[PDB]
Write a protein that holds these residues in place. Structure first.
Motif, PDB file in Angstrom:
ATOM      1  N   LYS A  89       0.824  -1.207   0.000  1.00  9.18           N
ATOM      2  CA  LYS A  89       0.000   0.000   0.000  1.00  9.18           C
ATOM      3  C   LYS A  89       0.859   1.259   0.000  1.00  9.18           C
ATOM      4  N   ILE A  92       2.326   1.446  -3.405  1.00 13.30           N
ATOM      5  CA  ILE A  92       1.272   1.965  -4.274  1.00 13.30           C
ATOM      6  C   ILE A  92       1.298   3.483  -4.272  1.00 13.30           C
ATOM      7  N   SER A 115      -6.569   7.186 -13.495  1.00 14.29           N
ATOM      8  CA  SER A 115      -7.133   6.200 -12.579  1.00 14.29           C
ATOM      9  C   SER A 115      -6.882   4.787 -13.091  1.00 14.29           C
ATOM     10  N   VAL A 116      -7.140   4.559 -14.384  1.00 13.57           N
ATOM     11  CA  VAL A 116      -6.822   3.280 -15.013  1.00 13.57           C
ATOM     12  C   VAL A 116      -5.353   2.939 -14.823  1.00 13.57           C
ATOM     13  N   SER A 118      -3.572   4.103 -12.103  1.00 12.29           N
ATOM     14  CA  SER A 118      -3.524   3.800 -10.676  1.00 12.29           C
ATOM     15  C   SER A 118      -3.971   2.370 -10.398  1.00 12.29           C
ATOM     16  N   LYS A 119      -5.120   1.979 -10.956  1.00 10.20           N
ATOM     17  CA  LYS A 119      -5.581   0.603 -10.816  1.00 10.20           C
ATOM     18  C   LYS A 119      -4.554  -0.377 -11.366  1.00 10.20           C
ATOM     19  N   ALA A 120      -3.966  -0.062 -12.522  1.00  8.32           N
ATOM     20  CA  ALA A 120      -2.942  -0.928 -13.094  1.00  8.32           C
ATOM     21  C   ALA A 120      -1.728  -1.022 -12.179  1.00  8.32           C
ATOM     22  N   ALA A 122      -1.828  -0.771  -9.002  1.00  5.14           N
ATOM     23  CA  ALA A 122      -2.217  -1.534  -7.818  1.00  5.14           C
ATOM     24  C   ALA A 122      -2.137  -3.034  -8.073  1.00  5.14           C
ATOM     25  N   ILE A 123      -2.653  -3.484  -9.218  1.00  2.00           N
ATOM     26  CA  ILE A 123      -2.596  -4.902  -9.558  1.00  2.00           C
ATOM     27  C   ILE A 123      -1.149  -5.374  -9.607  1.00  2.00           C
ATOM     28  N   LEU A 138      -5.503  -4.857 -18.338  1.00  2.00           N
ATOM     29  CA  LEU A 138      -5.242  -3.627 -17.600  1.00  2.00           C
ATOM     30  C   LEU A 138      -5.760  -2.382 -18.306  1.00  2.00           C
ATOM     31  N   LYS A 140      -8.399  -1.134 -19.000  1.00  2.00           N
ATOM     32  CA  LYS A 140      -9.825  -1.326 -18.757  1.00  2.00           C
ATOM     33  C   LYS A 140     -10.654  -0.139 -19.237  1.00  2.00           C
TER      34      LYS A 140
END
Length: 228
Positions: A89, A92, A115-116, A118-120, A122-123, A138, A140
């Protein structure tokens, strides 16, 4: 298509070489992102304009990268602690923050597209060492309409509501995904390698992030013994 991350995590590694996170040679940088497209003398002109729109953004990205103290932000987000490993975290937040403070907004276009990212991000870190990742999973919510350097049409005052042809939108999808691929498979792993020595506990915790200085202190007694 995959991102074999272990090799992406230990290729061109330059520990604490915070300057070599991003290719500061701008011509080399664009060939890094667009391998064949950026020196082909037979590129469609709609694409050549797209690259031209990109020249100032990459330039600004290099400038921001060179006035940034990466040593500063890691001491804030991921300081030396009781735990000798940095929580994912915290890793991240550190990565996302680094992107937010140096990347021009027009590189990925909108916050929606970031954001896409950021999500990528995170994964990725949450996945362990020696792990292939499906790249297209990814991409998305990537809106190619939010990114302006892919908009090369210059229409008269009247007909601004023009619909983009299929060939046009498909080409921009390719370009944006090629750039996104470079963010996740080149830039993100090079940020990680510079801040952290990355390893695995060999057990259930299969992804460990240890600050490079902390790691060097922890290995010192081991290296200091060598006399065989």
């Amino acid at each position: 298509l995959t991102i074999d991350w272990n090799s992406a995590l230990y290729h061109k590694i330059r520990p604490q070489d915070y300057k070599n996170i991003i290719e500061t040679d701008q011509g080399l940088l664009i060939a890094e992102i667009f391998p064949k497209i950026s020196e082909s003398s037979k590129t469609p002109r709609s694409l050549n304009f797209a690259l031209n729109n990109l020249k100032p953004i990459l330039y600004e990205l290099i400038r921001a990268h060179e006035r940034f103290s990466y040593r500063h932000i890691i001491n804030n987000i991921c300081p030396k602690s009781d735990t000798f490993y940095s929580s994912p975290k915290s890793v991240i937040k550190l990565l996302i923050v680094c992107v937010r403070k140096t990347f021009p907004l027009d590189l990925l276009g909108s916050n929606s597209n970031y954001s896409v990212l950021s999500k990528a991000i995170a994964i990725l870190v949450k996945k362990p060492l020696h792990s292939k990742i499906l790249f297209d999973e990814l991409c998305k919510g990537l809106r190619v309409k939010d990114v302006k350097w892919l908009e090369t049409r210059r229409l008269p005052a009247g007909e601004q509501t023009q619909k983009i042809p299929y060939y046009d939108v498909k080409n921009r999808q390719a370009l944006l995904y090629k750039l996104f691929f470079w963010i996740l498979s080149c830039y993100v792993p090079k940020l990680l390698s510079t801040f952290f020595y990355v390893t695995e506990l060999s057990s259930t915790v299969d992804i460990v992030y240890i600050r490079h200085d902390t790691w060097k202190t922890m290995s010192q007694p081991f290296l200091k013994s060598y006399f065989r």
